Structures are given as structure tokens and as C-alpha cells.
């Protein structure tokens, strides 16, 4: 009676993807979309800016797919900054093609780097930004906050030769409130997480359906979104662009891979790396813990993955008639299922 | 606000058929029923175009317990005619009685063929329809598009004496325009089969109990409808056709019989036969697979099974008082369940 | 679009009851209620027949405790009879006192029988009520059918000494149906027990609670319903109660008690005894088998599992506010729980 | 100090084969062996006598593929006088050919009955024998008995056109008691069968690879044995010849087998058929406390299927140990005893 | 009494290596080893002659490490001799040091090939030698055969310039009659394979422990043996070369690399490879099948597997005062420890 229920929220497995009539194999849909109103990718994937996923090896390869990697901030100013001129003059070797390549105007490779909100965030950007980074991503658990709004207008003010987004938000009213301060993109997700504990410590979430289509909702398309957490499968991705996203950002899909952070250890005959969410005791060695700690099986070239989940959205998109990214974020139709389906 | 959730879609186990006033017992009920608008069963059981459930000594023992078979089309068109040939050559023991079987005007066992879209289909229709089969199956994945239309329209205008089906769909909108096209009938089922893995792979499917109600409720019983993938057990069945189907596909539950394609296998003690998707990496040696591969239990003959699957169904229209498989079609009335039940 | 949905359908799990305003402690409480608008039991518990759960051992214990049982069909015209007459007979020893039995007009204990439609039933109905039967059970897997419906007009009208209930159904217009026939109770159960497998074999089925407020709705206390089939607690039972039955039947809750039919038979160190749907292959050695065979554990002497189920109704009833039975078939008022809410 | 431990005892899986220098082939190999003294078979697999396992359908099949089937004696005289009498005159189409037949002098199909020690025996076996049995099967929990003793002697005295085998025995000195009564062959198995409770219910037993043992040694080759119960894979029989066995019976084996009796159950989507002891109570039924379980196998299609698999991976083993008939395996075959991490 | 039980036999979980005086450190104890009697590795490694372990790849990468990989013999002549051939013209890239490379007198990778024998094996042997094969292994379920033994000392009649080893044996007697044949190495294991079914199909087998203690003991070192099966850790590794193995054989630690044949399979979101035995169904495609056929995971680059076995072996070595290859075989002692200490 006084409780307020703003909705009935769904989350990927409670929405399926209707087939449409479709004159598009899948092999020849398009996978371009744009990271921010000033960056567009090859495909619309986005590596997490987490310290067991993106390190300058694993954007290195994400540009090179056609995508990008955000640089985490789990290390010194010295060191982020050092990777981003990794990416930027990373030089292939003579005999490797890579057709789809995501590069800036100068022909390098493109790489994000995330930031926080404190003291050190001034120095932080003005490294990251002399190196050369493409978009600074302000990111935080809660960007609906002072923090991250009045940080992002600060950036975009202080430094418009880059890229900004800000995150991570679940509203529409969050969506807003970053567009006003000028954020190129917003990321969404809280809660989806695949090694998140917030909604079980805090009892905080947005299931990320419903997160998506409140933010893309609100904004009218004035600046694209990226799904952020929650992506199992690739059909996930095509339910997200359905939704309204412009990208989708993965942390578990991406660590155990080759090209992530960490070395590969021996257990139990097989062989795992370490996977762990920001929030967790480790990655924060005060707030108690949000995330969970642990070892995803080790699974080679990151190369071999993204292949295979931009093969199911290529799929997805055959399904759906949808021959462009656009068409399938805004054609898409969906039925919600039961807990039997 | 954004999003377009069409339905909740409601599948099997969403439902169950209610009670009604009977004066038929099981014993009594005709299971008889209309395949294409040409073609009538004696049992609404259809083998699935598989090629771990039907090839011609499944098709044979199909149409003699008054089904019929859909001969998979992974094999050469020669081969394919050659297992047509073997249906409609068949002459039964002077000691076997099949007294529900199902003839032709020429009183051979009928038999269907699955055909493509690509390049080769034409010259595989003239083999099979020259080789005397009764029915082409325009398969694929996704029958909501150009090609199978086209295709469907192409079999009806150069080949009609043959009955032609198209396939697979999950919306009334599909339905009608394979209708407009020609189809005898259409197949339906977008997700829901044992080995599918497409709603993982593109998020894409519809709940079939809500598949088939909107393709029956756009056909107004111009066409009829088969209702393909997903029936575990017999009470599937008597859902599909309360819902609006005419005859059911099943692959699971006819795999692992004698008569379907491959050896049974010796493993930890058991027989096995293998079962696998058409989609599944097995079948296809490009798509990412959309199908899985596994063994189920040898079940013997395939007419013991038949037997249980029809036995249930009769339970079921003696339960709703339906005489005839149209009398459940048209009288049927359901109640969803919850999680609970 | 086409598609008739004539409800989403509620079982036990489904719902709880709300607690209310109360002035009545458990053990205040009256369990009091009508097995047929002739016969009052002083227990709403019936024993279920099957040839697992109630033969003369178990129906003689049912009276005691104030409840009735229906002695099975699967048995000869002349030994169900025989089954009947230990009953009424039934002499219990001067030092044993059950002064909540469930009795007839001469002090006799009260018994039940079940018989079906075929050719045998008029000689069977015949038999069972020259014995002294107290009530006809015409008890089939679907009551709402001509042969039910007719069989029901047949005993009210060349038997009207004995009381006759019909079922198996799940719909208010199968009650209705039974009602003009001159039924005297309905059991209402398509689907719920714990050894059916008709939902999955025919794909019919009602869920319990929906199937209770279908029948009492429509029959609108002219009759009593029974709800069998599907209880598992004593919770269950209340519910079943608040949703508008006047008694409820059990199987499995009794099987496997000293006093159901069978022997025990220790299995892996542990005690058991065999349950099984009368539609299971072995209770029917043609319909392919809609019921299973396990077995259950050993209970002990039945009074004890019936202690334990009254007392949680007695619980309920506190909650509730309810001093008697018809308190709570009237006054009950519920929430619809999640899938969260049940786990 | 005060206890008396005979021996360890192995099982099967106690104990390997060990390969030694060969010539012949798997498929050239020999699986002809003795049932009986008078009796050979052209493989040495004898069917259970058991009312979930050899019935005149399994019985023909058996003699078919070269065994020998046990009709069961849990059904009255005359039924099982017109068991017997079904597959002696049995006779095949001339489109199919069974060329490894286990056929009489007559050119019958071979079969065996089982007989109790009850007072009903003396007219049992007088019917069977009158049906043309080949060999009479005086078949107990417990054959060092004097009653099963005396009703061996008896057979052999008043059916001496007949073969006799007594069991079931476990030890060497059982052996010599049968073998003095007259028995043509006797069946070893106290504890190894699949349904076998005996070990729990009374404490009784003998590992399979050491009764065979025990008694092949004992009786020193005078008339042969079956090794009943316990065998599980196609390696178990090979290790039971290798023990010095001349045949194998098995039950749960050929359970389930379209020729077994029993209706095929469908039970939650997989297709079945009962398999149960001797000593089951349901068998028992239709006052010895029970010493066997009831319960169900899967189905196994035609047992003609199982059969070849058996024999196949016996002819593999008679390859690995140089072994071109049976007795070479019988007689040369070397062991190791492994440990409990060799079968993990 | 007449069963013949030769002896209890030992697998490698029946016993440990026991620590003794140590002078020299694992990072400073030489792993080289030989072959045969003509060939000499750098390290103690041989790749399984198997469809799913070893072709032309993983044998560059096992000389490259130093070890030698077997081709395995299912494809036809000329596909096995063009596998061959790959190997031995193999030249390193600029930047690329394998300074434990395994090179014949030539510099070239070492390589060998399996053969069986059957009617194509006179032609095999001569395209595998022509092509430069460094050894030829007549590689059989059951090496002590008049067909293996005849068949290996037509190889080295005809010949005489490659190496030529024979298998698979599990007895001293087997060893000593394909020394008598001309054998210049001999490959134990009947049984211990991780995809084995031959103790369960037919009976057969030897606890690999034991089989190369008889086979080494009879042999006193006129030959070396190849330890072939059932190895899962790098103290087994320990074990075998301590019970008189001069090299061990694996396939499923190789398995699943990325060297190893096959492409990687997604499969409940992670990656595997296929492994299979040469005796499987799969593999055959008339004797019934004595080998399993699955996946494994995938494990990426071999030479991070070589490098932890390798790594292990050092450190045993260690612990044992073993300095070389040789100390081991010859100083080993071992304790035999009860399912307890298995625990
Ligand atoms: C301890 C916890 N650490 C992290 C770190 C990285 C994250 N990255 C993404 C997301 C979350 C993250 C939480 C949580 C929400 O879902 C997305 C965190 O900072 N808690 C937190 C709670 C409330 C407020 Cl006001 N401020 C911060
Ligand atoms: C790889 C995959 N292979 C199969 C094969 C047989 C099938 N048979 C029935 C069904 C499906 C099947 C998928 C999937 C949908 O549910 C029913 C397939 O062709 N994918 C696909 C995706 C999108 C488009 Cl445009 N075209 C094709
Ligand atoms: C085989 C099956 N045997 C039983 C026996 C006792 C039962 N007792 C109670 C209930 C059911 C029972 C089913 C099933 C429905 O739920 C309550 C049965 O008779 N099937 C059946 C189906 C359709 C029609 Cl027309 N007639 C009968
Ligand atoms: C109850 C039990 N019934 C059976 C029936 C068939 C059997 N068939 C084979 C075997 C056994 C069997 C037991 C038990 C030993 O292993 C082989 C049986 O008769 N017990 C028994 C115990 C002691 C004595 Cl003096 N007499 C008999
Ligand atoms: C079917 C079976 N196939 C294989 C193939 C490769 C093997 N490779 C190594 C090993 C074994 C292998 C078995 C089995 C023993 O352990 C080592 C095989 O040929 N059986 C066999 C049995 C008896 C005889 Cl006389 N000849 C051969
Ligand atoms: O400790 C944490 N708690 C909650 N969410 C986190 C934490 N660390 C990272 N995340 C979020 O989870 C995403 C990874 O989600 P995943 O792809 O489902 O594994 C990241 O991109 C972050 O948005
Ligand atoms: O690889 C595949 N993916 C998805 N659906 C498939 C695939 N192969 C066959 N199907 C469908 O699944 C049906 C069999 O479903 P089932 O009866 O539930 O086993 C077939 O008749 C096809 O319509
Ligand atoms: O074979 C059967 N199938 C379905 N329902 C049955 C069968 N046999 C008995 N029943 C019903 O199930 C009730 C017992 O249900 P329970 O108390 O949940 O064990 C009986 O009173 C009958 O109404
Ligand atoms: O009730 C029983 N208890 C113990 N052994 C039995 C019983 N019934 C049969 N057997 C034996 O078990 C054998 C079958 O063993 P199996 O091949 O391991 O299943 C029969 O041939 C009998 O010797
Ligand atoms: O099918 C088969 N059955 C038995 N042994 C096999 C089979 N295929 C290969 N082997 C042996 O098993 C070894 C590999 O064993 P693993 O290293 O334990 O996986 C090979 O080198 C062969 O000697």
C-alpha cells in the first residue's frame, strides 16, 4: 500500500527473441555500432575493466577483433598510462591480417582506461589522455551519485578531445542526469554481474532487461549504452541489443582466455586462471565485499570465443531480418517466458 | 517502455488440458487426423527429418502404425530417392497385419522428404517426387523467410501432385505467408526441441503451446499444422492438439529405437544409439552449431513406444470427451499452472 | 487467440492461509464435519481407496479415531462384503476407550466402499449395502461422465437407505452434474496424488486448490465435496479446508502404516511397505498405466500420523480464528505466494 | 589362534590374465567346452535357471548360439515337461541358419531342467526326463547337503539315460561329496551372484575365482564345472576358465533380453524387465528368511547380441594368453593378484 | 591349488620412492636418457603413437623439447611417410632456441612411426625408412606374438639402419623373445592405459609397476624400455624410471594440447579436445573394441605440460640423490603403501 514497485523488472532468461521475416543469412548481417557518439567498432563488443580481464594484451586483441578493451584502474597512474602506449603503438607483425581492426584517425589501434572519482582521478586522466587513450571511462559501482556526474562533466569540460562515459547506472533518471553532464555513452549494469554479491550485501539490483530498456528508454538514442554484466551466452548479447544496448561489455566471457591477465595454474589435472570481481577482498587488498573471487577454466585465444559469440549474434540477427546493428535494436520483439521455459 | 514484449508464451508444462463431460472411453477414440490438406493419418505421429531417427526402415514402420516418416536430407539426393523407392516398394510378410497403415491411392505405405533452399533442391525434388514420394518437407531453420517461401511457391507450381510443407515457424505471421504460398501445410517450432540449443545460442524461440495457438488461430484450419520439437510425453501430445495442432513431430522419442539409423552401443553395461541435432557439430561436418549430440537408451522396437505415446493420448480425449482428434482441436480448454505444479 | 485459458489454476503450494483475530486456543477447537449430508464425521480425515491404504484393518482404526475409510474395489463382491461386516461388527475390548469413534445410528462403526460401473456394480452396491455399508463411493478416474453420472442416479434411487458419492472430478459443472443425479457428497481429485502420473501421462489435471473453489463455488453447500489426493502436511489439509472442502482423503499419508494392508519389508536395514496408484501396472494386472509402485516408510500404528496431522489443523484453526470446521470453510482468506515464497 | 581362516579368497576382480606368446587368432580360436562329462557345448555360456531369465524362448536361443539354457522349476510338472518338450522340437525355417546349434545325437536342441529336493522331485524328474531333457539340474542354495547328495544318486540310479548336475557348492570337499553321489558336473556359487543377499542374511560365502579353484582342484578335471553367478563383463568369464572352469551360468547377463520372460516395463521414459532371485520373497511367494532381491534391468534387445559380445571379448582374451581352445586356457592360464588401487 | 598366481603386481598408487642422501640439486640432474640402444633423448618423453596425440606437429614439439613423438599408423602409406618427412626437413625460425633439441647425426628432429602387421607392412616400413624415420615401432595390443616377433626381425634383417623397437609386453619371458628377435627397444604396458578396457573386455592385464620390473629385470639393460600407459602425474613418471624404465610413453597428458591433433570443441562453454583409443569403436572404423573414446580439456601448448612433468622429475630426482637418468633406474627403493596411504 506504501510499498512502491516501480515495475515487474526482467532479466535476460525471462525474454526470448521472436523470429521475423528476414532476407539476411547471418553470415552477411553487420556487427558495426558505435562505443560512444564518437567512436564506432566493428563489433559490439567490450572487454571489462576489471584486473583479471583487460590488461593491454587483451585490448590489443580486442582491437584487433574489431572491438575494444577497457584498461582497469586497479594500478599505479605510471603503469595505466604505460599501457595505453602499448595499444597505441602496437605494430602487427608482416604477416598478420586483421581486416576488422578498430583504429583512431592515426591508424592505432583504439583502448579505453577506466577512472574513479577521488583525488587522484586529475592526474590519472591527464596521463591516460597524453598517452593517447580514446575514452576515459568514469566507473563506479553507483553512477547515479555527485561523484561520477560532476567527474564526467569535469572531464568532458577539461578534456573534449576525448571520449567519456560514465557508469555504472540502472535508471533512465540516471541516464539523464549523465547526458546532461555530457557523457559520450553510459554503461549500464547493477547487479547482473557474474561474481557480484550486491543484490544478496546491499539488496541493490535492476535486473538488466529492464535496466537496459529504462535507460534507452530515456535517452532516445542521444547517446548509445553498454550492457554491462550478466552475459552468459551470446544469445544474451542479441537480447541485449534488442533491448536497446549499443554494446555489450563481459568480464567472465573474456577471463580464462589466453590474452587475460594472470598466468594459468594447474589444478585438479586442469588448468584455470583467476577470475574476481572488483568488489572483492582481493582485488580490494571500508566497504565489505561485492564481489566473489575464483577460477574460470582456462580457454585459450581469446579469438576462438569472440568468434563464437559473434557467431550467435550473427544468428540472432538472421532470425530477426535484422541486417544491421540498428535494425535489430529497433525491430526487435520479444515474449517473456515462464520459470517453465 | 521502449520494449515490445508481444505475450507472455506459455509451453508445455504452463498447462493442462481441463476435464470435461465424456461418453467415450480411450478405447474408442480415433486417432485419425490430416497431415497436409491432402494427406490424412491414421495416428497424428510424424518422425522427425533426422538423421538419428528417420531414414526408410523408420518411415516403414511409421506408415504401418499409421503414421508416416520425413526422411532426413543429410545424403545424396540418389541416396534420398533410393530410401523413397525402399518406402513404396515395401511389401509387407504374408504373416504381418498393419491394418491402420498408411497408404497411397496405390495402396503403398506413404513416406515424406526433407529438402533445402540452396542450389541443389530443384534436381532433389524431381529424384523424390519421381521416385514416388508423397510429401516434400521444405525444412530449415528459419521458414519465415524469402528463400523457403520461394521455394514452398516453386514446389506447389512446378510439382502439383505433390503435397509440399513448409517450415519451421512459431508466428501466425509465418504461417500466412507460407499459406498465401502455397503450403499444404506448415510446420511449427522455433526453440523448443530436446537437443536445440538455438535459445542459448541466438536467444531466439517462442514457447510452443503459444507457437502453436498463434499459427492455428492466422490459419482458421485452412492449412493444418504440425507441431515439431519438444514432446517428452504423451500428455504433450494431447496439449499440442487442445492447442491447435493436427499431428505432432518427435525426434527424441523415437530415437534409440531398432528401427532408427545407427548401431546400438555397449557403454557402462547399457545400449545406447546416439541422438543429435541437425544444427549440431556431428551433422554439419559456417553456422556456430545451434544443436547438441548425445546418446539416449536403446528403446527396441519403435512400435512398442507408438504404442504407449497413443495409449496416453486416447486417456486424454476419453478425459475431455473427444471422440475424434477434431473434437479436442476445436473443445479443448486449458488452465495455466504455476512453478508449483 | 485462440487458445481457452479458463484460469491460472492454484495447488497447495500456490497459497497460505492469513492468521485472524482469534479467541481459540488449538486444543479448543472442534474437528467436527459431514462426510455426506447424512453422515458427520468427527474428524475430516478419509482414508483413501486403494489396496495399499484401506482394507477392514484400517477402516476399523479410521471410526476410532472419529474419521471413515473406503475399503478398495480391487477385491471379490463376497470379500469386500466380508470386509464390510468385520466393521460393523467390529467389537473393541473393554479396556480400550475411543470416545470420538465415528458411528452409526445403532452404535455400529461407520465404513465406506468403493465400487465402479461395469456389469459387476449393481450386484456389488447390492452386497455392500446388504452388509451394512454405510455410504457407496461410485469412484473412477472420471467422474464427469455418463457412466459415473447415471451409476450415481442408479444407487440414490433403488438404495436410498445408504448415502453414495461420486467422483473423481475437478469442475464446478461435474458437481452440478452430480448433484441433479442425487449425489450426496463429490470427491474432488484430478490430478493431485502423490502417485499420479496422469499429468504427465494424458496431460489433464486441475490443481488442487483451484479444483476445491470450482466445486464448493458451484455446489454452494447444498453438498459436502471431499478433497483427495495431493495432501502432504497437515498445512495442506487447512488449506483445503479454508478453500471450501468438508473433508480430505489421504493415501500416502496412511500407507505404510501397521494397520494399511501389506506387510513390512526391511530394505537396506530399513522398514517399508508398498504404495501404489490403482492405475499402476501391478493394481491393474487396455488403459496404459496413469499411477506408480514405491514404497514408503514405516509409520507405526496409524493413530499416531493422524495425532500429528489433527494437531497441525488444530494449529491452523488457532491461527485463524476458528472455533469450528465451517469457521474456517467460510471465514479463510488467503495470499498467493511466489516461487521464492514457496522454496 | 582358535580361528580357523582356510585361505584368502579372490573374486573376479582380484585377480588378471597375463598375455603369453601366441599364434592363433581371436577368430580362430575354439569355444567348444564340456557341460557335463556327456554333454559338450560349442560355447561354454549356460543360461540361469531363473523365472526372469530362461523360459523355452530363451532355452531355444541358447542352444541356437551353441549353449544351453536351465528351464526354471517355479511352475508345476506338466508345464515344465511342455518347456522342455518346446525346444526339443523346435525346428527352424530353412532361411535362417544357426550352424553353431547345440544339438542332441538326434538333432535336437539341447536343453536342461531344474529340480529341487522337494517332495515333489521324484515325479518332476520322471516328466522331464520323459520330455527328453538332456541333463537334470538338482539345484539349491545349498548342494553339501545330504539332501541334495541323495537326490543326485537317485537321478543317476533311476534316470541313468539322463545327465545330473548338483550344486551350487563352494569348496573342494563338496565337490568330492557330489562327485562320489554320481553328479556328471557340478555348479559352483555360494555369494557371487548380482542378487545374492546370502552374504548379509547369513554370513556365507566364497569368492568366485576360489570356489572355482577350490573345486576344479579337487576334482582334478574328473568331470567339469559351472561357474554360477558373479559374472559381470566378458573378462569375468575368461577369468573364471582361466580358474579352471568349463562353463559359465549367468542371470542379470541375459536378463532383460527380448527372450527372457517378462513384459518390457515402461518406467520415467526407459524401457525394462524384472530380474529377480530365486530366494526373492516375491519369488518365494508365487520359511526361510529371503536371500536374494527383486528389481529391474534395461532392456537389452535380442540376446543374440549380447551373447557375441561375450564371446568376442572371450576369443580376445584366448588370443592375449596363446590359447586355441578352451582347455589350453584351462590349463595354462597364469594370474597376478592386483590390488585395490589396480582396480580403481 | 593349481591356480597360478604369479605374483601380487604393482600399479604406481601401491608405491612410493623413499628419499635418500642428496647432493645435487633438481635444477642440476641431467634427464638424458635413450631410446633404444642406438638413440639418445634429452629427456624421458615420448608421445603415444595415437590418431588424437601424435602427428607431424606434436612430434616437432616433443624433439624440439627432446623428447620424440610416434606417428601414429592410421592413414595411408603415404600420408604417414609425408608426416615423416615434415619432421625431419623442419627448420627452426630466426629468434626460436631449442638448445635441448632431440637431432639426429644430421641435425635433424628425431621422429619415429608405428607400423602394425598386417598385409601393408613391408611397403609402410619401406616408404617410413626412405623417408628418413628414425625408429620403427611395431606397435600391437600383443607384442608377445609370432606376428610382432617375426615381424621385428624382418626389420632389422631388411633393414638394418633404422632402429626398430617392439610392443606392447607386460612379462620378462615376452621381453627376452624380442630381444632374441633383434629389438633395440622394448614398450611394456598391457592394461594401464587411461582409455583401457582391456582388463574388462578380456580379463587381461599387468599393474604397469610390476610389468616393468619383470620386463627390465629379464633384459638387464641389453635394451632400454619404454614405460607405456597410465601415467596422470609426474611421480609416476618418478616411479616407472625407478622400476627400471629408461623412457616413459604418454597420450592423455598430451591430449587436449594444442600440438595434439584435432580442433578444439566448444562444449557447455568450455573447450576440449578429442581423445581416443586405437582400440575404440571410432578409432576401428573383427575384434570387439577394447578402447574409450571422449574429451579432455583443452590444455594450450605442450611445453607448458612437458615443462611441469619435466619439473616434477627433477625434483624426485632430488629427493633420491639421483644426478642422472641412471641413478634413478639403478638406486630407486620403494615402499609398498595399503588403500590407507592411497587415501
Ligand atoms: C564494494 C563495491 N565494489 C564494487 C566495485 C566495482 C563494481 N563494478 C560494478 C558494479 C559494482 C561494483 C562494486 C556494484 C554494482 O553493480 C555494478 C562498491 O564499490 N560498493 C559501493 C556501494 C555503494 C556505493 Cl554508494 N558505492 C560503492
Ligand atoms: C545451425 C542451425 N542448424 C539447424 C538445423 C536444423 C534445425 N531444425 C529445426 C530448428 C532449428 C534448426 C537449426 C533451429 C530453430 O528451431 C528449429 C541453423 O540452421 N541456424 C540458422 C540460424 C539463423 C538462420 Cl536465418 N538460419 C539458420
Ligand atoms: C489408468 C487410470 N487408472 C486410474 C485409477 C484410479 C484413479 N483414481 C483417481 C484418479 C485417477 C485414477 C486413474 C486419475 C485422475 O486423477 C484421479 C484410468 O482409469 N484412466 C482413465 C483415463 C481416461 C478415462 Cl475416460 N478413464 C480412465
Ligand atoms: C532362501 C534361499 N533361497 C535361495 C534360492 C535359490 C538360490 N540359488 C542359488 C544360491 C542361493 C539360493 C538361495 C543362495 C546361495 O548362493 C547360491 C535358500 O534356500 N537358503 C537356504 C539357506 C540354507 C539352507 Cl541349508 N538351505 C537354503
Ligand atoms: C581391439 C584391440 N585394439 C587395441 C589397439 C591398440 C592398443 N594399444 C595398446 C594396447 C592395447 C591396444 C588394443 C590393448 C592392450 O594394452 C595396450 C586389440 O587389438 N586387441 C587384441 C586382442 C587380442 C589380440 Cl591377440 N590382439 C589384439
Ligand atoms: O566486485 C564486483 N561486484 C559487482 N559487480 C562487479 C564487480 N567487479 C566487476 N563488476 C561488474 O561486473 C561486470 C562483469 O560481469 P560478467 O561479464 O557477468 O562477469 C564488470 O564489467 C563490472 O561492471
Ligand atoms: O540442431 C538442431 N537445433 C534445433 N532444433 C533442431 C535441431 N535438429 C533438429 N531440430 C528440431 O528438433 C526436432 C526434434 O525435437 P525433439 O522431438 O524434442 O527431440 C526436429 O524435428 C527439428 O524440428
Ligand atoms: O493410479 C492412480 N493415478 C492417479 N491417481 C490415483 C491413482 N490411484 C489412486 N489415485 C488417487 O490418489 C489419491 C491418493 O493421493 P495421495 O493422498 O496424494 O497419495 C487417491 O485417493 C485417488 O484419488
Ligand atoms: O535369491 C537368490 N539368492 C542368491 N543367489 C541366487 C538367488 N537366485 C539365484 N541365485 C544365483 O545367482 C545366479 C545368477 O547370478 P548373476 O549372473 O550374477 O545374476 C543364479 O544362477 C543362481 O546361482
Ligand atoms: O584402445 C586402446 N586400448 C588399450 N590401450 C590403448 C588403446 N589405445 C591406446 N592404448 C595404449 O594406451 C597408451 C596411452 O595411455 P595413457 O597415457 O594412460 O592415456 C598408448 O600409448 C597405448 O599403449
Same mark, same amino acid.
Given at each position: 500500500? /506504501?510499498?512502491?514497485?516501480?515495475?515487474?523488472?526482467?532479466?535476460? $532468461?525471462?525474454?526470448?527473441?521472436?523470429?521475423?521475416?528476414?532476407? @539476411?543469412?547471418?553470415?552477411?548481417?553487420?556487427?558495426? #555500432?558505435?562505443?560512444?557518439?564518437?567512436?564506432?567498432?566493428?563489433?559490439?563488443?567490450?572487454?571489462?575493466?576489471? %584486473?583479471?580481464?583487460?590488461?593491454?594484451?587483451?585490448?590489443?586483441?580486442?582491437?584487433?577483433?574489431?572491438?575494444?578493451?577497457?584498461?582497469?584502474?586497479?594500478?599505479?597512474?605510471?603503469?595505466?598510462?604505460?599501457?595505453?602506449?602499448?595499444?597505441?603503438?602496437?605494430?602487427?607483425?608482416?604477416?598478420?591480417?586483421?581486416?576488422?581492426?578498430?583504429?583512431?584517425?592515426?591508424?592505432?589501434?583504439?583502448?579505453?582506461?577506466?577512472?574513479? #572519482?577521488?583525488?587522484?582521478?586529475?592526474?590519472? @586522466?591527464?596521463?591516460?589522455?597524453?598517452?593517447?587513450? $580514446?575514452?576515459?571511462?568514469? %566507473?563506479?559501482?553507483?553512477?547515479?551519485?555527485?561523484?561520477?556526474?560532476?567527474?564526467?562533466?569535469? @572531464?568532458?569540460?577539461?578534456?573534449?578531445?576525448?571520449?567519456?562515459?560514465?557508469?555504472?547506472?540502472?535508471?533512465?533518471?540516471?541516464?539523464?542526469?549523465?547526458? %546532461?553532464?555530457?557523457?559520450?555513452?553510459?554503461?549500464?549494469?547493477?547487479?547482473?554481474?557474474?561474481?557480484?554479491? #550486491?543484490?544478496?550485501?546491499?539488496?541493490?539490483?535492476?535486473?538488466?532487461?529492464?535496466?537496459? $530498456?529504462? @535507460?534507452?528508454?530515456?535517452?532516445?538514442?542521444?547517446?548509445?549504452?553498454?550492457? $554491462?554484466?550478466?552475459?552468459?551466452?551470446?544469445?544474451?548479447?542479441?537480447?541485449?541489443?534488442?533491448?536497446?544496448?549499443?554494446?555489450? /561489455?563481459?568480464?567472465?566471457?573474456?577471463?580464462?582466455?589466453?590474452?587475460?591477465?594472470?598466468?594459468?595454474?594447474?589444478?585438479?589435472?586442469?588448468?584455470?586462471?583467476?577470475?574476481?570481481? /572488483?568488489?572483492?577482498?582481493?582485488?580490494?587488498?571500508?566497504?565489505?565485499?561485492?564481489?566473489?573471487?575464483?577460477?574460470?577454466?582456462?580457454?585459450?585465444?581469446?579469438?576462438?570465443?569472440?568468434?563464437?559469440?559473434?557467431?550467435?549474434?550473427?544468428?540472432?540477427?538472421?532470425?530477426?531480418?535484422?541486417?544491421?546493428?540498428? %535494425?535489430?535494436?529497433?525491430?526487435?520483439?520479444?515474449?517473456?517466458?515462464?520459470?517453465?521455459?
Amino acid at each position: 500500500s /506504501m510499498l512502491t514497485i516501480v515495475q515487474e523488472a526482467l532479466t535476460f $532468461d525471462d525474454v526470448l527473441l521472436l523470429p521475423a521475416y528476414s532476407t @539476411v543469412l547471418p553470415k552477411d548481417v553487420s556487427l558495426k #555500432t558505435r562505443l560512444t557518439r564518437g567512436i564506432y567498432l566493428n563489433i559490439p563488443l567490450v572487454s571489462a575493466a576489471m %584486473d583479471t580481464v583487460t590488461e593491454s594484451r587483451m585490448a590489443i586483441a580486442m582491437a584487433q577483433n574489431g572491438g575494444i578493451g577497457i584498461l582497469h584502474k586497479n594500478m599505479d597512474i605510471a603503469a595505466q598510462a604505460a599501457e595505453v602506449r602499448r595499444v597505441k603503438k602496437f605494430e602487427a607483425g608482416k604477416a598478420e591480417s586483421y581486416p576488422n581492426s578498430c583504429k583512431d584517425d592515426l591508424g592505432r589501434l583504439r583502448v579505453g582506461a577506466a577512472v574513479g #572519482t577521488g583525488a587522484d582521478t586529475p592526474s590519472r @586522466v591527464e596521463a591516460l589522455v597524453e598517452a593517447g587513450v $580514446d575514452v576515459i571511462v568514469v %566507473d563506479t559501482a553507483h553512477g547515479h551519485s555527485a561523484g561520477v556526474i560532476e567527474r564526467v562533466r569535469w @572531464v568532458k569540460q577539461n578534456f573534449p578531445q576525448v571520449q567519456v562515459i560514465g557508469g555504472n547506472i540502472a535508471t533512465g533518471d540516471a541516464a539523464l542526469a549523465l547526458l %546532461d553532464a555530457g557523457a559520450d555513452a553510459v554503461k549500464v549494469g547493477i547487479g547482473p554481474g557474474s561474481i557480484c554479491t #550486491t543484490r544478496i550485501v546491499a539488496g541493490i539490483g535492476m535486473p538488466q532487461i529492464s535496466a537496459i $530498456d529504462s @535507460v534507452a528508454s530515456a535517452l532516445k538514442d542521444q547517446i548509445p549504452l553498454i550492457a $554491462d554484466g550478466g552475459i552468459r551466452f551470446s544469445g544474451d548479447m542479441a537480447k541485449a541489443i534488442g533491448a536497446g544496448a549499443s554494446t555489450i /561489455m563481459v568480464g567472465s566471457l573474456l577471463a580464462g582466455t589466453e590474452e587475460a591477465p594472470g598466468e594459468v595454474e594447474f589444478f585438479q589435472g586442469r588448468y584455470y586462471k583467476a577470475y574476481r570481481g /572488483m568488489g572483492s577482498l582481493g582485488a580490494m587488498a571500508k566497504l565489505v565485499p561485492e564481489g566473489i573471487e575464483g577460477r574460470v577454466p582456462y580457454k585459450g585465444p581469446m579469438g576462438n570465443i569472440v568468434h563464437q559469440m559473434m557467431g550467435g549474434l550473427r544468428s540472432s540477427m538472421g532470425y530477426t531480418g535484422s541486417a544491421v546493428i540498428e %535494425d535489430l535494436r529497433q525491430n526487435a520483439k520479444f515474449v517473456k517466458i515462464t520459470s517453465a521455459g
